[PDB]
Amino acid sequence: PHTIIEEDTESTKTQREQEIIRLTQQLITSITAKDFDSYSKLVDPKITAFEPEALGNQVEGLEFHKFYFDNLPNKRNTTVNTTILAPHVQMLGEEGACISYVRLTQGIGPDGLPRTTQSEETRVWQKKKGVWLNVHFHRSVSR
Amino acid sequence: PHTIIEEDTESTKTQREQEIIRLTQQLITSITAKDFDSYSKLVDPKITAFEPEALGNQVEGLEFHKFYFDNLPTVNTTILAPHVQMLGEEGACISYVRLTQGIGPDGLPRTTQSEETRVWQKKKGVWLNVHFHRSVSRP
Amino acid sequence: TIIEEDTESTKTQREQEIIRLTQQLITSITAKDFDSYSKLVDPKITAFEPEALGNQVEGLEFHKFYFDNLTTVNTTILAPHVQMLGEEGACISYVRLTQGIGPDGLPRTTQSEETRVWQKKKGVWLNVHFHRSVSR
Amino acid sequence: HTIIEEDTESTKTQREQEIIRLTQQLITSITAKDFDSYSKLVDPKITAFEPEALGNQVEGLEFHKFYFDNLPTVNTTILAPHVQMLGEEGACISYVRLTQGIGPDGLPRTTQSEETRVWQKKKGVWLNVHFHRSVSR
Amino acid sequence: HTIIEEDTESTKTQREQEIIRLTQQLITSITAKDFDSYSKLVDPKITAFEPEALGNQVEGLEFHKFYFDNLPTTVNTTILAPHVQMLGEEGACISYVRLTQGIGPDGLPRTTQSEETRVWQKKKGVWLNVHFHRSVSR
Amino acid sequence: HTIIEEDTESTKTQREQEIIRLTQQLITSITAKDFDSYSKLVDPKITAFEPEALGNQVEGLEFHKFYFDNLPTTVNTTILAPHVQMLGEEGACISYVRLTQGIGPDGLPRTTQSEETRVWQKKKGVWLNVHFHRSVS
Amino acid sequence: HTIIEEDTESTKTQREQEIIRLTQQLITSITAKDFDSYSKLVDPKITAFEPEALGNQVEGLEFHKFYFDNLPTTVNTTILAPHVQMLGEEGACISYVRLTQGIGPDGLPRTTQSEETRVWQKKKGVWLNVHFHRSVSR
Amino acid sequence: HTIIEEDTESTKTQREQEIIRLTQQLITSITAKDFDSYSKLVDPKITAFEPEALGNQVEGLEFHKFYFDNLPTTVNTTILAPHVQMLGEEGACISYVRLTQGIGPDGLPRTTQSEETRVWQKKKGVWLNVHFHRSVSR
Amino acid sequence: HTIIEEDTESTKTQREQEIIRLTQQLITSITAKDFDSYSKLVDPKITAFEPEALGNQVEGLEFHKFYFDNLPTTVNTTILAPHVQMLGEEGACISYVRLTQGIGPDGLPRTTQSEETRVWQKKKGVWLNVHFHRSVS
Amino acid sequence: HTIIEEDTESTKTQREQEIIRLTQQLITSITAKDFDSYSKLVDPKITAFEPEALGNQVEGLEFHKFYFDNLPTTVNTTILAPHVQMLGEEGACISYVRLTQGIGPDGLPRTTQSEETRVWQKKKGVWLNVHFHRSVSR
Amino acid sequence: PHTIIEEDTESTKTQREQEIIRLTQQLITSITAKDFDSYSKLVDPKITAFEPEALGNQVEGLEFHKFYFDNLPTVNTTILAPHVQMLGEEGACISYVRLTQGIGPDGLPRTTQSEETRVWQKKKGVWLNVHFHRSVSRP
Amino acid sequence: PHTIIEEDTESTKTQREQEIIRLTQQLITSITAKDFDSYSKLVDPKITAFEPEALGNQVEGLEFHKFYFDNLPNKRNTTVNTTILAPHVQMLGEEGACISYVRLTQGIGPDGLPRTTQSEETRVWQKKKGVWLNVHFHRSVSR
Amino acid sequence: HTIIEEDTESTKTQREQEIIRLTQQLITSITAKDFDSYSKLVDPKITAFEPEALGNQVEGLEFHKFYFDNLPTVNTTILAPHVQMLGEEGACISYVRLTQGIGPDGLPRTTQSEETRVWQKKKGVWLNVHFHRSVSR
Amino acid sequence: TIIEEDTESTKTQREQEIIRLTQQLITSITAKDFDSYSKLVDPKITAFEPEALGNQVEGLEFHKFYFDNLTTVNTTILAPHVQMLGEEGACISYVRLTQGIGPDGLPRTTQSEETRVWQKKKGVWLNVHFHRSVSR
């Protein structure tokens, strides 16, 4: 029970930019649904990462995140609702792209408590042999 | 006194990504020296930014950072493990750990750490920083 | 049940309807009836609420998440100010006072300041924007 | 005192663009403490929801004029303005206001508020008849 | 479920005394959670200032009714130094210190104190409470 | 010192309009600390519930005169939603929310909210305040 | 549970000795929760100052009768240095330090302290407690 | 600085009115730090219960005379609801709530509260305070 | 229950040796909670300063008997540096440090230190404790 | 620099009274920081239990002398309910509650309370303090 | 489930120091699996150690760590930026950041970080860990 | 006003081990005296480090520490007394050595307050062309 | 219960080596709660400084025998033993004791104490006449 | 000045000298006279003190650091136990109670438990080990 929502606003993006947004949406769907095959198809095997689970280190490879796919609750236990706020997409020539957005996640905590979480995400995509892959992402949370 | 040091340890970088590292070094130099002219020369005027000064929002433009070049009142900035991924011919992405050694109220030494991602785009033959993302992890 | 408090007087016939429409809206919220809610709310509604964490959200899905989760409550509208905007605009602002039961068997009262902006689209009034605040 | 709008890379229609410009002039009169321009842009019977009102709804200019008369480097930034038009005489603009300033010490601090302003075209001119300021925790 | 009124020394006038009686009946309907007597003693458009209203002024019975619908035997209220000021033939203003005794979660005796001002209006020969103000000092 | 009153809606009767005006003059006399005007508007044996009384009920004018003589510049009192209920011909009861904008120890503006209930009694053709009740939430 | 007086030095007169014995019987009815014995020794219009009154002065038997109808074992109350001043034949005033030893929630022995001042009035040949004042030092 | 009494309702007898006036003169000598006027109104062997005694009962004038020789402007003491009970011709007992308004370290106005119980004895035609008890509620 | 005594150095006179022995028997009667032995060793009008008295000075046996009847297995009392000073022929004063090893609520051993001063008076040829003073640092 | 002793009611025997006097002189030498009078009233091999000794027993004058060498006008001590028990012809044991009043860093009046037990021995016809025990409750 | 991952990013190691990394991986595996036989095979019996379990003291021998192999009651250990400096023919020194992903009381995920230095000595043709130094920096 | 003291105990070390101890002493003397030339002579220009000033990162090169030589108070202001506790030296063939010890430092704080600091140090030495150099050190502090 | 000594890579003289072995036997009797071996290795008039004594100096075996009689996986490690001999009948051994154990939960905890034991050769056998246990903060 | 407290009795002539030597040692400490201190203390003295942070230190330099830094104090020795060890050993243990003035003008008292071990080296007694503890 999870669905990903984007809201660009009145602004209409480039068709290319629109595809980067759609791909990012698919990736987030892989993460919330914990489908590691779909995640792996969209992400480069040598992706560098900056996330709070890294404790200020930079991590490389898929295994660090495959830990979260193979573990953590399945997804049946609870329901989630992620939302992408103001996605800014900057194309970098023909083979690069950089999408940065605010991620707002609605869910249920330990009890039947509804809570909202905000994180700031930067994802860099590289067009490798006609296929866009996520080569680096950087996820922070405000204090 | 403001100096900037990179630490590539044993790995070897290509000339392109070595230049991305060099440009990032100059950028952070203009930051620590509060030289906004050089900073403006290295940064695209429509630059997006994620930083703790923005309170979890994404800001655009130069005025938001030019505020800090003004108004604000001996440090060593160190770039740790610069990962530079080239993106075709007009893209580049360098992520690193920014370690800052400095002085407190007294002659007291303290170190701060932030994780930075900077995205460079080659616009009309020159490299410009079009987006950066600065984080500080659970202190 | 919901209680309105105009204090004194009767509003004009146009803004009285805005008050009643707000009553039906809050009724759909408290009763968790999403059909009436979707009928009263524009599909591209912008929103400022504490559940949005200082962000502005748009669409119904963000709010429909709250309809699909979770008996006796008493909401009360304090000093409604309705300002009409031509023939196709209306802006109602009021203080929402809610009475309910928390985790234990103890009664609690919550206060929030709500500002709803209604638009008359093709003869029917729809809420296109609302702004919910909570004082500290 | 400099004010910057951030539409994203979008262009609004000619009608709502003026709502954006007028809002910038309003925030300008607020930051510069110029009550004359403020009074020209605001209806005298303006209802208001702001943290200075302590969860109450205030009306009139006197409550706000109290703030123009006290105290003499700031940078306000308008994040994601949404303008929904209401016929020919109504407009509703909502945005996130991001303020950079200097506090008691010489330290830069940033504050974020959410603002929703409702404008009414009264006799060919636009006046701000309602506004709602919230602050996230 | 017994309410004690403490006139201190000396005796007031009879008309003030009846206002005191009606206030007692009101608080009895409150501690006994008897909404019928409460509705008999209270005007349907009563204004109220109480800590449950969060610095707002509430009107009507539903705001207090809600409280009567939800709760359940052991209470004791005491009216401290009631001042009753008559207002012509149709007005009355009684103000007093309310002292309530009860039992919380665990079996320990606790006492709460509030300051109350109740305003009675003589409508059609009967007295009704048209406004009350409940405060608590820190 | 400015005392502003706002009724959300409706016109009061003439009598209760006067009750509102008399309350306004009273609050003015408090802010200006003119004890002669205050005493003219208030009964010499007025009972009172206010935070300065520490949950006690005080009577008389001296308890309040103490504040008139020792306090001893610019403040803004706003009166929100006055509910006036007349009691026959010789009684009246007005209850309202009071907002106070002022400057504290700093150069920073602060707002204070209190809920007030005043009871007026007409004696010999003159309305006097005989009891008031001020609480803060 | 039993109560113990501590006269320390010197011997009191035959009048004040009875005041101390009656105070002992009173506190005995308090610790044993026997309201009958308490009502025989207390005037029905008794004023009271106690921490359970929150700095107010309550009147009547019911304010204290609420406490008799709550909780059931072993306690030890001691009257430290009773000072009895007689006022003619119909007045008496005894002030003392009440020291209580008991068990709380856990299994521990403790010693609470309160200062009590009781005023006795001889009404129709019997001594009655018309006012008591309970204090606690910080 | 001046002291104000609040009799509220009713009129006291001619005897107890003098007890209240003498209490006013006493607290006046306290707030003005005039030990001469204080010594004229207080018996030299006065017992005392006050928070400055830490729950003990002190005797003599010097224990309080220490406070007269310390600190120098504007204060306001009010006697709330004085209850005076006469004991023949040579005894009197007044209990009241003392409410003090003053300025602390910073420039702020405040209202401290203490409960006072004073016992007056007529010794050779003059009334003297032989025992006072100062309490503070928490 | 074991009561151990240790003098760092020196031999006491015969009298003060007996004073030490009587104190030992007293502490034994407290630990074993044998009130008959305690009463035999203590004056019926004994004054006392102990933490159980809350800074007051208590007199008599009942105050202490309360603890004999309600407490109601293995503890180790060690008496450190007894200073005995005889006062003529009918007085004596012994002061010492008392260590107590025991088991509290847990299965963990805890040690308690208290400083005690006992005053013995010989009445009719029998030594009785007439005053003791127990403090804890 | 004045010490007040409070015998409460009634009068003790003369021999106990002199022990009280000598205790007063001792504490005067303490508050006045007069080491000569202190040395005249105290045996050179005095044992002591005081909070300054940290749960240890100290002996001799140097431990208290040290205190007399270092410090400087405003103090007031009061001896509460002195119990004096004579021990034959050469022993005496006085125990009491000491109540001290003074001024700390800022100009605020403060009161401290300690429990003291002093043991006097009649050595060569004069009384000397051979052991004292200073305690403070929490 | 216990796995161990190294992250050499772009740099290239020699076969010797690559084997030092491999041996360290096996060592940490025997730690997370609490397999003391393998651990003893990789560790010299007179090994010195600095670790927070030692409270600022330096311990020697195996019994101090064998205590933790006993008595103690799904994790991913990751070796970050392994710097391996060879010391002639019989010495080696590998220092790295040890990042540990694991589960709390609930199915709650948490990450811990420690900095480790391990010194290897070639004794009779086999490599043994003769000294290690484990630190945890200002959490 | 600073001097470095070693105390091996009754145990006598190897002559080689003794030299490693002496070299370590010289290095610490360079640090306390803030003589960067003497420090640089004993330390390898590509030394890796683990110290609390690195915030859980590993640092390489001299500049990170030359920051502390060129800044910080000179050394004239106060007096220091460092002490090396139980130095354990393990030789690694002919070209490696590993010395680990407890560092106890006595000094004066902000006021005239004497304070003691303990840190645990591991220093690795490499014999490069007949000259021992410090190639890695690891300094921790107990909690 | 296993005990490990850590001389560093040194060998003591034959006389002090026995002091080390005997100390190991003493700590063995302590960890195993075997009072018989303890009493054979310890002089009956042993003075003692330990945190269980609350800064006081205790003497005898009873104070320590109290601890052998209460409670039934531990690892003690002796760090840097210094043995200074005193003629033919005295010896002073001081060391750092490092203890690994399990607390209330199933969590491993480590404690560190500093111990100084003074042995005396009494009639050809070595007895521990004094010990001093400290704990750093 | 320093005060000894044998409580009662006189020690034997051999251990009395150990007590006096301890007095001279503490005198050199309080007066910060390092010459007498070095004369009374063996150059290879082991030490357990709170200034060593749970470590055992050896030598005079660690203590000489404290002689070269920083009027009226009163130290007192409580219940000294002196146990002789043959002809060339002695072990004295005692409670040290120190009276002094802190930062302000207020008197403070500190307590520590000291255990000194003396050795007769070539006819003269030297302190070869001492162990200073502080109770919490």
Numbering used by the authors:
A (entry chain F), L (entry chain F): 331 to 473
B (entry chain E), K (entry chain E): 331 to 403, 409 to 474
C (entry chain D), N (entry chain D): 333 to 402, 408 to 473
D (entry chain C), M (entry chain C): 332 to 403, 409 to 473
E (entry chain B), G (entry chain G), H (entry chain G), J (entry chain B): 332 to 403, 408 to 473
F (entry chain A), I (entry chain A): 332 to 403, 408 to 472
Reported in the publication:
Ca2+/calmodulin-dependent protein kinase II (CaMKII) is a Ser/Thr kinase that is particularly important in neuronal signaling and cardiac function. CaMKII has a unique architecture, in which the catalytic domains are linked flexibly to a hub domain, also called the association domain, which forms a dodecameric or tetradecameric assembly. We reported recently that the activation of CaMKII-α by ATP and Ca2+/CaM triggers the exchange of activated subunits between different holoenzyme assemblies. Our data are consistent with the idea that the CaM-binding element induces the hub to transition from a closed-ring form to a ring-opened lock-washer configuration, which can release or capture dimer units.
